[PDB]
Design a protein around this ligand. Structure first.
Ligand SMILES: CC(=O)N[C@H]1[C@H](O[C@@H]2[C@@H](O)[C@H](O)O[C@H](CO)[C@@H]2O)O[C@H](CO)[C@@H](O[C@@H]2O[C@@H](C)[C@@H](O)[C@@H](O)[C@@H]2O)[C@@H]1O[C@@H]1O[C@H](CO)[C@H](O)[C@H](O)[C@H]1O[C@@H]1O[C@@H](C)[C@@H](O)[C@@H](O)[C@@H]1O
Length: 485
């Protein structure tokens, strides 16, 4: 009926009025503002300092694990080969160790007679980039990711690959930088995510007839040791980004899922799309960290010398407090978005099957294997704890409800303080709208005292009007409103 709508609208406005009235009062009381500030600094600590219990940590971890896991699933079908500078080769076998190959802990790039590129074999230049990102990630994950507040942790990373076959120049001193291919070294300063890392490149030739060589051919083995690689959230998401984008940029031929021959960037476009979005949301989330750290909540507000707190003039801290609280809300929203992108309960079709049946599983034999473990059975499965990270992310979000409420409270109070005059007018304006709604309901003379107000020229806080709610009238209004229907 018409009248139900009038009672519903009025009940809602009375709820709003009462909440705004409370926001005004909270914003004029330093002991309440201080408790909300303290709760806000404590949630920040949680988000940025904790692991298991931080949705921010779990969302970063999930973005990283999705990328590593994607490669563990599709690597073994992805074709690679050729000689340096992305050139076609005749007989170049280049093997990368600690990679999820078909029944192997290496991937063999041995596609001869076809020019590397889009819908062809991945060039060795791209595989070298992909593989370095993958080794950094797997090494960092085995050791464990630091909390979002530790941005200067470091890891050492070592990996090896070999070249064999007549004319293979992917391990030549020209390409590696070493003094002598048979027995050589080169050290340089390499930039990774804006940091300087020391890199040591070693080269040796193992002759076909050397002791311990069961392969029946001569090969060159190249060792890359990176010391001091950054393992921060930021740096590892950059590596996850490099890994996924290098796969997309190369878009290589594969040869095996809903498709069993094609190009990786096509048959797996939906998965790539989700994982890029996860990395980007996680990076934006990590960017919110710096806003949080810049606006700390440790100092009590209010004047300490007897001056009553005046919200019009004594609230210069509120802008920082709003930036902080808004940035923490933003971190939660993004973390939730990382989770939604890959959660199999929200997916359908071949994307759901890829996630449940491949990405989120591990074929490694056993408490499962540690993170960063590659075995002869990894291929076609994620082996990156992706199923359990989805779960730990959903759970950390659900158990962060306490802090989510406190973040909301701080956003509301800080917004009020930043905009005090304007929020205090809005209270008055909500009053005025209620007074009209009241005047336009039937026979209801005894409800017209539901709100009232009084002048107070003496407020030491500039709060020259007091706003009231009559509890009886409110209750009656609430009953009447429920009783339709
Ligand atoms: C090709 C090839 O691998 N040639 C290397 C050779 O053995 C081969 C045996 O694998 C196989 O059983 O027979 C084949 C003949 O059909 C091969 O020849 O082994 C020798 C000695 O161990 C390698 O030579 C040495 O290492 C090089 C870098 C150089 O210092 C030599 O002076 C040293 O003796 C030989 O490698 C090739 O050597 C030539 C010069 O003879 C060129 O340097 C060439 O670049 C080089 O091949 C390259 O290095 C290989 C070790 C291997 O990684 C290959 O893929 C790469 O292209």
């Amino acid at each position: 009926q018409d009248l139900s709508d009038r009672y519903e609208s009025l009940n809602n406005l009375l709820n709003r009025y009462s909440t705004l009235n409370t926001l005004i009062k909270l914003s004029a009381d330093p002991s309440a503002i201080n408790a909300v500030r303290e709760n806000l600094g404590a949630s920040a600590k949680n988000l940025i300092g904790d692991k298991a219990n931080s949705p921010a940590y779990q969302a970063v971890l999930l973005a990283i694990n999705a990328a590593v896991g994607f490669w563990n699933v599709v690597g073994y079908v992805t074709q690679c080969g050729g000689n340096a500078n992305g050139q076609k080769s005749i007989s170049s076998k280049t093997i990368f160790n600690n990679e999820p190959g078909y029944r192997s802990t290496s991937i063999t790039c041995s596609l001869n007679g076809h020019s590397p590129g889009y819908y062809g074999p991945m060039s060795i230049e791209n595989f070298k980039k992909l593989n370095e990102a993958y080794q950094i990630l797997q090494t960092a994950l085995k050791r464990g990711l630091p909390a979002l507040k530790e941005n200067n942790g470091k890891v050492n990373v070592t990996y090896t690959y070999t070249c064999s076959g007549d004319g293979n120049n992917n391990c030549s001193s020209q390409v590696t930088g070493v003094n002598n291919q048979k027995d050589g070294t080169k050290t340089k300063i390499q930039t990774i995510d804006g940091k300087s890392v020391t890199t040591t490149i070693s080269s040796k030739v193992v002759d076909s007839r050397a002791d311990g060589n069961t392969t029946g051919v001569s090969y060159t083995e190249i060792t890359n040791k990176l010391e001091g690689v950054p393992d921060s959230a930021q740096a590892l998401l950059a590596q996850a980004s490099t890994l996924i984008n290098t796969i997309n940029n190369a878009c290589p031929y594969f040869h095996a899922f809903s498709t069993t021959t094609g190009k990786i960037c096509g048959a797996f476009s939906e998965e790539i799309s989700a994982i890029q979005k996860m990395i980007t949301d996680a990076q934006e989330l990590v960017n919110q960290t710096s806003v949080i750290n810049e606006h700390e909540q440790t100092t009590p507000v209010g004047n300490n010398n007897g001056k009553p707190f005046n919200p019009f003039t004594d609230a210069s801290f509120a802008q920082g407090m709003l930036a902080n609280a808004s940035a923490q809300a933003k971190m939660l929203n993004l973390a939730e978005q990382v989770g939604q992108a890959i959660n199999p309960e929200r997916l359908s079709g071949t994307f759901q099957n890829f996630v449940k049946g491949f990405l989120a599983t591990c074929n490694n034999p056993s408490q499962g294997s540690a993170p960063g473990t590659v075995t002869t059975q990894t291929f076609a499965s994620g082996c990156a704890y992706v199923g359990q990270t989805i779960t730990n992310l959903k759970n950390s979000i659900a158990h962060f409800g306490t802090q989510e409420q406190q973040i909301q409270q701080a956003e509301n109070i800080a917004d009020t303080l930043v905009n005090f005059k304007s929020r205090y007018s809005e209270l008055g304006n909500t009053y005025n709208s209620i007074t009209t709604a009241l005047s336009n309901i039937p026979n209801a003379q005894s409800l017209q005292n539901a709100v009232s107000k009084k002048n107070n020229p003496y407020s030491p806080q500039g709060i020259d009007t007091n706003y009231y709610l009559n509890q009886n009238s409110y209750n009656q209004i609430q009953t009447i409103n429920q009783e339709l229907k």
